[PDB]
Symmetry: D2
Subunit: 456 residues, 4 copies
Amino acid sequence: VRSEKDSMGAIDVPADKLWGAQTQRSLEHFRISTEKMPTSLIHALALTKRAAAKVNEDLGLLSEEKASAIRQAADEVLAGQHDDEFPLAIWQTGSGTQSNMNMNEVLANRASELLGGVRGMERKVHPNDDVNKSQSSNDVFPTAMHVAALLALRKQLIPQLKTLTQTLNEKSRAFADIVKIGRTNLQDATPLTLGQEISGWVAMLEHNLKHIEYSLPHVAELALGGTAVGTGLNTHPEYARRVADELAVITCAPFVTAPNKFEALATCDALVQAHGALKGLAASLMKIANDVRWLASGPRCGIGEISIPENEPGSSIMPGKVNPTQCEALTMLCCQVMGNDVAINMGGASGNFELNVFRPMVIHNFLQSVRLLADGMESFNKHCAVGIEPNRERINQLLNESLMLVTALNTHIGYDKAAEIAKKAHKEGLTLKAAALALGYLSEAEFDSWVRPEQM
Amino acid sequence: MNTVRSEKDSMGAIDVPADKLWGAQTQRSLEHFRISTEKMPTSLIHALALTKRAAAKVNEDLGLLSEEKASAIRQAADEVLAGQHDDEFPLAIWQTGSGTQSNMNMNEVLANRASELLGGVRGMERKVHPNDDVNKSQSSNDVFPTAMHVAALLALRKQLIPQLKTLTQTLNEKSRAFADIVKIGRTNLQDATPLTLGQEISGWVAMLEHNLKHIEYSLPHVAELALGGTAVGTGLNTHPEYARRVADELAVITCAPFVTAPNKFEALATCDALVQAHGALKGLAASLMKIANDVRWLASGPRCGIGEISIPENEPMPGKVNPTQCEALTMLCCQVMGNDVAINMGGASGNFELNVFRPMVIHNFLQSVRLLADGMESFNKHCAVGIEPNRERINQLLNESLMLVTALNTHIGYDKAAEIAKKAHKEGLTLKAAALALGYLSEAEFDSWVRPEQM
Amino acid sequence: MNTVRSEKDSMGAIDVPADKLWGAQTQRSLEHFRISTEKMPTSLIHALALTKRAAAKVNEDLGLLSEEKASAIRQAADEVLAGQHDDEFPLAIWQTGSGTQSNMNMNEVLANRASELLGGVRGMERKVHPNDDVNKSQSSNDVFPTAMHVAALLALRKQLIPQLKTLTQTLNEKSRAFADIVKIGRTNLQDATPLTLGQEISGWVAMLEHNLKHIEYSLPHVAELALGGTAVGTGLNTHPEYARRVADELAVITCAPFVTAPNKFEALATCDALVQAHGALKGLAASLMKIANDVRWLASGPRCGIGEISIPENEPMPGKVNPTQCEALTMLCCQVMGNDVAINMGGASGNFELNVFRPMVIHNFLQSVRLLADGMESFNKHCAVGIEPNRERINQLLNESLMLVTALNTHIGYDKAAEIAKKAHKEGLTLKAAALALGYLSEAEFDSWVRPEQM
Amino acid sequence: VRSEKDSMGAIDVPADKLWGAQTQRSLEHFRISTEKMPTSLIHALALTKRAAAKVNEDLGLLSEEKASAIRQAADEVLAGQHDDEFPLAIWQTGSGTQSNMNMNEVLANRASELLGGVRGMERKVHPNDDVNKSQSSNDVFPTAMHVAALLALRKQLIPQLKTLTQTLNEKSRAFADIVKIGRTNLQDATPLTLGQEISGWVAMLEHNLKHIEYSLPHVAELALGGTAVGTGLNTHPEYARRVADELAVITCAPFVTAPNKFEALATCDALVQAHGALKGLAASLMKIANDVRWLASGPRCGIGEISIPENEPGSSIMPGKVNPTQCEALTMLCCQVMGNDVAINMGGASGNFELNVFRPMVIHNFLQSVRLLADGMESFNKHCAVGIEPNRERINQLLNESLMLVTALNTHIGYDKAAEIAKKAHKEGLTLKAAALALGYLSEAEFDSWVRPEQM
């Protein structure tokens, strides 16, 4: 072990670790559950420190040697070299201070080594004085939250959403000619094509993309520069804009400094709103997944209008039972996003005065929902959606088995007469044609020429 | 009526419509909280009247109120209970969080009415006083919470439970009636091993029986009353026997096991009893959601769905029977789920000596009880009692499935059985047709060996 | 009225009170769905009337309905809009999930009323027919969803937004007015570095401005109407120009930018536009919750709380001013949160061509709009406009804190400043008293160096 | 790598791993997020397999050599020797089949080695035929869910709840004599003792324990024996009761076989109900945590009636700022439990016919809530509750600064006169005594003898 210290005294930290006294102290005070900061957030925090170092250097507040060393240490984190250096639980200080310090200590200790120094109290780079220069945990954590959120939405969620939409759009086009029985209130209704039904799914996904895009501008606003309470006390006048620009450059995302730092520090409003669009997407996906598994139900005693790829092995003596597992995984994660929204809403509604201190929990839920939806759509697309195929025989069997087509006969025979054969078919368990012919109201030839499902 | 009456309070005089029994404070509240359309539920109004009726009786017993004043207030409360003054409580749910305004609403109405009952008049020259007489030995802080529990316990005991038991009985009868009807099972929405319709329905019965016990376990906490704790729970300004006597009186007149809360601080500072009780209700909502969904899917058709059962057609596409009772029931189950979140939020928000999210909490709670009780009652009489099996459809499905292959194992071995199954599946044949095509058995043998009743 | 009228439908004859305008189907529904007390909101009833009014005009334009029949139906709808028939829609929210029963309720009322308007009579010998005339070119499946969006968009545009903008303006005025008042900051509920009251309030303003934009972004999806998609979205049984013309007509008469939905399948199969729009509302509820809480805590007292501001006392312990407007507002914010869950559940539950959780979804949505609009209106006029700072209290707090020590750093160095702070904290002294005790500076110097205005 | 296979063919699995073909297949098909099965569930599943092996042996369905080998492999899992052998995500098959197979493969491969055999297709113990004998994924997963839930509630949650209650009960007793100002609607109200206020917290915790205990009997019912659809097809008549008894013996918990297996398989009702009591506890804890942090707010511009231990270091120049971090961690996890309840409710309401397939998600949320509440109460107790101390001076200052005590004077002077001095004190900013004396209504001696706060 090694001995690191702070204003409360010294504490032993494992020698093979880059964190310091404050991280070790929190590690012993917040032993709650198993949830830790996700990688995306660790990376966003590293990026925030990297940008702060550059700007501080530009303003002459930090020496080139230290500034470059810090950025290099930050790049190592981004490169996956220090994943084991962030052991803190989500259930910590509500402001995220301890994760801010965790990063400050890891970066300082490593930066020291990079400068021919050593980790520990003999270090050349200081966590608070150097790595956290011109910052406050108060404005740093919210900044990291927005960076991680916007990048996750732009880099993961949106591309996956686009891909699944394209796949489903191809399917609607491919099945544009297949007429099937409609179902309203779960009952047989008027026909529509399989392609039309799928176009509904496509339109839902397209609308969702638009909604998600509308939430991005607010998430792009950064708190950095607000300092402790939003006033900006102890910062160079250009710091907030400069750091926002630097972040935009290195991430290639349109980040801007929050026009009102009081709103930025005192609330998690951008995320409460952005998540609203995410629970909206969860509801749409749930409906799509449900339609797929119900339409694929069977093989003999369900609907069975479509078939989906069998991805897991099944019993030799049970050929036919294909459980819609991708659909099951998708509906389960959709329920999760709904629950996650409630946790975020409660935390978001609970800020007091100058600062909202429910942040770690809010970001934990938000990033998980993005993760679930992005990976969920990817998995559903590759292992299910791309392989949806119609069971043409079943579809036609059902179509010709229903009484819904009697409508076409009305245009060629009085309402009551057409309804009459429908009553007999229904009562006798006969098909529309069998009933029609047996009732002697028409012949096979004229019936078949009158009942054209493809003409709606 | 356009004519007004000038009533007044600590803040001054204000006009009240002459034909109304409320006073100055109710008028002020009415004018300051014009938010939405939700008002106190009738059940809560009655619970408040009962609370005032009990407080009066005890105040009389303790020599705190005159016999005449006490009997007049008691009589006025009975009129409220008889439904003679439903038009006298115009306050919105979105008022003061302690429910103080509704407490005063009852105080003013009962005071003005009791005055007339004593040969007096309503208004500032009334013989009975809202605060001094009707609210004697009480506080809005401890009155509203008490009214909340009185309404909640009575609604659960008199409405919800009986309806739950009735539905359970109906389903139990159906379970026994269809005990011999074998149908195809469905897991993951896929065809599965057989079970009888009676066994499937018995699961619904067991769900409801389990729910009943959970609801019963929540009742004792709701039976605890805050009355007597006054402003902050210390019971400052009350007779030492008051809290106990008023609880006894309420118990006597309601025939419900009401008891004074052992810790008045917990009683005034939280809505914990209701947060927990509602947890049992959202559990019932989840169970009902599943039962209702099973029913509508099982009855889907008439030709392109499952169609194993038929349900009563209540409203006027020959066989298109929309499962409307199931639709009303599933919709209200979602409502109960949302109501739970609103209740949890309000329950988690108490500060120091008092939880001030009470009108909202009771609004949601009583709504969930109404929805579940009436929903079960409607679903039972308009759907459950008339559920009938479509035996022909059930048998058609059973015989067309590949799931009965299992019965052949002991007769021809697993390998041949699996071969028959694979062939039927690949060629779109029934098990019998595939079996006969292969020549592994005769039709007579298939008929004798494949007995779905021995699943 | 005890006297009945015999009305009939496909299912037969049923008695309807003679003094009512509804018909057989509304009576059946009324008797089958006696669940709770929630009925269709007035705003939804009016939206339905508007929808029927537009459908009639277009049917006339397309030569589908006679000029006389069309004008009579149009006139009947206007009466509904004028509030002349609020007693004619008794159906509960807990009915058929497609809203079919409320569609028929409007059809029957408009048919019976239009008949009288044509010199005819109500009942089975009416001149205007519910289905053939009033529901011409329509389906319950596409009518209810349309009425939902008409009500939702109008409520958001005419009620919610204006009230939001007004509150924002009031707070902005307060922000500018108190721009020079320095107060102690509070992070984690602990004393923190100073900021002005004006800056703190500007955060509330920015929150409301941001909320307005989010709400605006949700409007175009709500503006899409399902009318014309008929039973399953294919538009079977309608004129090819119908969907477009009816949307135009509604747009003309409402002055709202209504458009026909580009994909009718998405329109009939989901409530996605409302699930998303409500997401913006629950966001506003979270912001309002924080603003309301800040106000009540800042005004807590009068002696043992924060007491930095004073709020208007609206109802009648000398300085005990309960923050009732804040209490009503925080309670309704919890309601909006719960409503969101109910909406999400119903929205996620569509099956195939139709979402049948509609009455429940619109019930919750319109309630959240009413609550937020009226809540902001009430909070603004009865609280926000009269917020005043307690300058003496604010200054007392500032001077008693240890947070101003920072201003001494540039004059005496960090080490001495920290020493003064530690001493004051350990001994329960003010910074000045500790500074003077140590002799690090004179009172004149402290007074000149510690300028809170330069924070 | 090694080559394992199933009915879909062969697939390579890392040689140094004990899982098989089906686990490897799922690993590639369900790459969703980062959530995996928690240790408590893995252990419960191992325990379920251990019990099944014993009973199967007792009924002669399995040979002693294989049965003992399986139990030994199971014990190794319980001992923490194979944590890295369960890589499957929560977002998998809704029935939990893939986790059931993961355990079957790990146990079979290891059991083979224990019998002088080898892992892989050459194994002496077979995953399906031996380890899963007399079972079905359908009834095995629900059983594992209940075992993990009941044990977590009994072994972790309840003891922590009891401990925190005892600590707070000691505090109420200790501060039974300290009179303070009450607060209703956040406004100054009539006095009560600090001990009384704390007794309220104690009573809340005691009521919650009762509620949690009421939910245990239903959770104790096990699905094992129901088989695929609840009928029990393919099992010895005594199997269900025997396995339930065995489980009771090895865990020392009162497990019983579910009286109705259809209810047990088709729903997650016991957990929906049990979680109801947990969200109830979250609401109570939230209120307690909030009271503590508000009462400790300050040090100069808040309430400051109590002080709590400072666990993290602070600025040298800012002595006094003690952020209530344990309270912040506790309120954050409470919001989480509320959100978790919604996800569970949606999954619980979504069963279809014979089986509810939202199980992995339900158990994931349930176990997390237990974890959060148990660890949260432990942390709050040790690092905050045990160290709550009153700031007697502040408490008295506030008490004597309020106008609420004017009530005592009423009993010694007319309502209006007492109210009169209250008006002056309030208007002039004077204390009750200063106003009373200046108004000449009484003397210091008689005032002090009349205004006795300790007499309520």
